[PDB]
What we know:
- The structure holds 2 protein chains of 2 kinds.
- Chain A is mostly helical.
- Chain A is about 65% helix and about 0% strand.
- Among the domains of chain A are: about 170 residues, no CATH class; about 150 residues, no CATH class; about 190 residues, no CATH class; about 120 residues.
- Chain A has 76 helices and 4 strands.
- Chain B is mainly alpha-helical.
- Chain B has one domain.
- In chain B, about 70% of the residues lie in helices and about 0% in strands.
- Chain B is elongated, with a radius of gyration of 24 Å.
Amino acid sequence: MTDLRKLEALQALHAELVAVRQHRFEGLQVLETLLEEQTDAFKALIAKPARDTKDREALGKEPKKLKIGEEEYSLNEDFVNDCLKLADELDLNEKESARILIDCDAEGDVETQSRPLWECGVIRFHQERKYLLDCMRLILEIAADEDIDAGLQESFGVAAEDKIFGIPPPWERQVKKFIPRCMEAMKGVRSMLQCMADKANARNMLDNQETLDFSRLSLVEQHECLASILHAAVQRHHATIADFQDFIKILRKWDKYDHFLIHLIPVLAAYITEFGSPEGMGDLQQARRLNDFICSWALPVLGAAVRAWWIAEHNGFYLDDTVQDLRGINLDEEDEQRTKQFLDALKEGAFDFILSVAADCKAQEWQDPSQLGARQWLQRKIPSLPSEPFPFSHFLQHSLMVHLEGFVDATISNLPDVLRKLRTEEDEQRQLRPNHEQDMDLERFLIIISYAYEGRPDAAMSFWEDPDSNLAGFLQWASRRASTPLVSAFCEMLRCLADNEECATAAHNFLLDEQSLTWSQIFKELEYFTTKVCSEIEPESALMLECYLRLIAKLATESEIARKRLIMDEDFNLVDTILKLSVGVIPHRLRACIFYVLKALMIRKTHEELDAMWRWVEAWMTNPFPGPQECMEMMFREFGTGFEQSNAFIQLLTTLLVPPEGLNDSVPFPEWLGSSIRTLGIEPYVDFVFDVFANRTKDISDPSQLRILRLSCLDFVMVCLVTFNEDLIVLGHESNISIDDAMAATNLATYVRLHPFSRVMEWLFNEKVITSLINTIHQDPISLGSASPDSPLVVSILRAIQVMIKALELQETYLHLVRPEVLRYQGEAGVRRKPVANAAYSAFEDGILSHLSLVVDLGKYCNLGHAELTLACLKLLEKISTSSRILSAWSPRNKAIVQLERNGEGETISASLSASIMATLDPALAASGENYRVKLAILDFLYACLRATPDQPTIAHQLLGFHCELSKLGIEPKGPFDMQKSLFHSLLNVLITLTVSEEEQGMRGYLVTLKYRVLRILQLLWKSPLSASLVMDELRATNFLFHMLLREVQIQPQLPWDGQLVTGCEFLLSDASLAYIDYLASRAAIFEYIGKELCSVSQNRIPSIKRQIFDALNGQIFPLTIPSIFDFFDFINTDYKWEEIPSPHFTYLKDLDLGPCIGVHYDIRKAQEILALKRKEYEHSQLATPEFLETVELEEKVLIEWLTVRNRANLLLTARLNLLQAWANLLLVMIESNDFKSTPKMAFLLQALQAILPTLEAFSSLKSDEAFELARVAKVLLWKLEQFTVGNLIGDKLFQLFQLCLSAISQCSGTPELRSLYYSICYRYLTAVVDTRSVTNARARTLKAITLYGDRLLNVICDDAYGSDTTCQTAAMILLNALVHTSRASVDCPIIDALNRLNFIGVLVDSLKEILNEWASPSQQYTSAKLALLLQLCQTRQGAKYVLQANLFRALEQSGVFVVALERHYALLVALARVVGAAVTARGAHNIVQGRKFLTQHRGLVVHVLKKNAILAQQALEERIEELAEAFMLLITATGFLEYE
Amino acid sequence: SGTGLGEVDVDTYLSNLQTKTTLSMIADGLERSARDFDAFLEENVTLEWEAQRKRIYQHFGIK
């Protein structure tokens, strides 16, 4: 929007500043326009108007109407009370509080948080200052960024100078400075916090605790922002002596140690650096006065640290006598004074306080267990923090480290003699009284140095570039003979000074000899301690050993030369020493450090290193100084005690299982591991890991340690499982022993027997494992909500879900190609193994189907926002719903539907899913947008849940907002789905508001996939009759099809797909084919839904929606216009030639067919193996193998594409077909169910005819699948039939269509159904259209068109007659009658002669026999049409000769043929008598003999009919009898039987 | 109301439409054949001897 309030404006400004900070300058003008609107806001940092009594009285007198600026509002008894409460809580003016509450009400934040209005007002008031200060902080930070353009760096600087500091720019120009305003603001914030704490303690000594905590967080953040702004202002040299004295006085009056001091220490540090150090107002006259003034305090350590810093920064002046004047001033006196002052400051605990502050600054919730107890062995007497949740930022830590390293450099380059004398005094004290422990000043200082130089290689390199500088000098001097604490501190410093590889290599080269410390003395001391332990130990020795181990591990992890040298050094033997030391009696810390050192050494390794490591491990575990089987388990149980050593050993094992090539054959361990002794190889290790993870997880009290151990175990299991070849074993078991030789079989057998995958699965089939897993996944929601995305709990849950997924995937492979082989091997050979699996649990689902809270926890974990965790939970739920045993146990009433209806879990899950799918996505990060991935995962889950077992309800129906009842569904009153607020309605909304028509690219791909998945889900819900009625009701009540049509887009060969054109050859190979198929399926589903709804509305006899549907279809909306249905018929185009494909030459591999490749799906591997075998045979033939090889290769690179192309093409084809079918169906529903007049719609009929004309002309005889769909609709619409032009056009189109039908009939194309459709189309044309110069011309032209084909078509018509099909034969029989009639209408006829030449009359008359057996029913109508055709021929004079030569008199006798059944019998008799009479009377006196013979042989029967003639069924029977009598009388009078007498 | 009231499905709707079209075509063909036959008989009998053809038989055969 644009009319944003204060909160929204500040939020937008903060977002723009953060974007610009992340190297995104797409909002420069936006920032320039925003900074001008909030100038009054940036002028004053924070200021709350004092509570006025006038406004209070005015609000309390007439709380009816309020006027704020230009707006007016109405006040009520509740809003006035809220205003008064807010003003009393925050002591804010009534007007400002009223404005804040009006803004809160307008924004409508009461429902988003569900809290009192006054609490929301307070939250908004805090957010105001929060953002107002964060904007200034980010502005000042960007103004000093060196990695950006100088222009913007100066623009932001001048903007901050003009707005924040209120100092006008150089091109222009009572007021108060910025430092006093900031100081007053900080004082007010402190007083407000104090008053809030006091009032809270008074009232508590509720539902507002979280609000108070958030307010305190906002206040401390605002204080930190103000401190950073003040530090920046001081660094800009905008301070004076008055502010310095005021700050010093405020410090002297400090009461309690808290985060405020840690936030203000940079302020005074910068003050001293500007005034104290010669890096600013270097006035020696003022410097001496400041020194005399600084040199009351409520905390002596603060004064000591301040004096030490001032002395360290002031020594820069007393260096030379050329840059400044030092005349008439003594040096030795001042030197001794500063020395004694610094010694006093040290004795008071300056460095101790500095170290405590540095430690409390980086206080992390969790720390790596590889550095436990490090830098935490001192005697700290400074009170600790209250442990309240006040986490620090990153800029503050950076500034603190910068200041610390600067102070270190100053102290090292200015006071070397001080450190020398301090070290000598400490040494003398420790010598003259070893029983006592001297001060830790030097150790604390070295630890502070280490903390300063951490993660900053740019500054760490300074200690190695110039080896003859002050830094390198002190580094080399601090390595001489000293005590254990100093050596430990130096080792820790070296460790922390190895953030990269270059620093690690530099430290390695500096420590070794090219006296100072050397590796020789280190290893000598190590061997001495080893021999002493093996033939007590003091804490100092243990600390020294731990420090040495940590340093070695860090060097090996960072450097490479040291890792490659020390690992195989013959003079050191580090591995031997650490192994001899570990086997001794020592705490677990040393063992953990040794394990971490080994891990570091083995983080990158090769075959020889792995072999040596395994050799040493076996040698030291087989006889550690009692049989080996006992010693190994003793050592395992010893290393299992605790968590540090156990976790370190687990990590070492996990690292050792990684192959040297990195993350397929050559399992990462020697195949001969444990061959000497009778051991299973590596199985004992996995067995111990699993039993520890299963049983020894109860002795861990620290939740963090338990989480870390579980994460390590899950990582180990995943590393063991991912190192198993699945496809390899499948191909082996398939073709190795059955096709290939038995040579490589031994390799696969050994791989399957030695790989721990089988044992891992066997353990996974245990109840302890799944119980531990479901307990770890089962945690309270508050922990996950308050935890960090990188928290160990989330990572452990993710690893557990991944392990479960991998197990569910590989359980089949295990039970099939692992279990039987292992069993056979154990039965044949001699192996002693202990089963750890449950025989009852036939599958992995048997052990977990008894846990119902798992799905509940998985669903509740969806409202956390973690993309990976959400996707994992969705995949797990999908796989669970896809199984069969779980749903068989749940629904054998049910257990799942009741589990999710305990405390409204389903409702909140549906709400979270709706809020997620409603969340927008990033157009740039389409395929990477976590939101889109979560949406696709949810859609796939719903699809899989609805597709499996659709008849019976499932969890999907409940999540959609339906009342899942036993074999029944329903909706509840006032429920979420009833109020149109549910997952289904959310999907509908996000679908109708989705636009795919773009300009930069056009027809995007991922939106198409989203809508395709949504439509698939909708179709699955519709087809299910259990969830069809309510769905249709809810859809038709919201005008879904209307919104869909409004969102439709026309397709044309010009609009490209994702910037790619369709005609391009790469289209078939690119991914646009998927989007095209998806769009086709979407159109098909939309057309199907429209047709179904139209049919339903039409069959319900209600014009309420009928006329609306027809208006939307015609292109008008009551007016908004839209393309009609005929416009969407643009996907039928043969120009692309999807069927035709250019076949390359393929000079070689031509004989390689796609037999074994082939639901048209040609597998590529079936041909890949064939071509590989052929290439191998060709190479073995040794005939120009190297040269032509390339040829073959590229040939493959062709055929692969070819294959895929076909597949793609095939898909497209069927897709089109589907769509077409749907369209056809829709069109049918549009023709029959249409009560509207016919003359107005005639235009649409002509348009459809014109559109289908080219389609039929292009697919007249190509394919017989779409022809049926396009011909049945034509047949239908042909029977449902200014005016002169319309009639002429109709006649022309019908005459044109009549040609292709006869063409296809003569060519014998398609199946009998398509031929019957063509026959009907031609029959309704030759019977109604033709039946007056125009009529004669049309008849002659049709006869000419028929003669053009001639007997070629009559032959097929006769062939398809009296055949297998029942309808095609009758259609052909009727078409023959129509043809002969139309031909006679034009004394002879060529059609009868052609039929006689084809021997059709002969077989037709021969089939007359057994007519009684054949005679509503299809056979009845077929025989009726046959007799009608036969009678039609007996009317012509020429046909008489052929009908007589056919000898039908002897055929009608063998049949023995001579109220409704009687009517049909009389009708058949009438037909036969008519045929006989016509045949007799056609020729003349040549057939009278046959007539007389027939009348004499059948005398008497005709007499009954002639005497009979002399309610509806009765009249029909009488009419049939009359017709029979008339036919017999005609036969008699034509034969002349009277003359015979 | 809606969602089904003595209604049918699209799969059966199209089948019923096709069956009705086929039955109507067969009925129209039968009616046209009958009408053509009746017209032919009327044209062939209207020449002469309309009532004599039956009177000769009524006189010869038993009335």
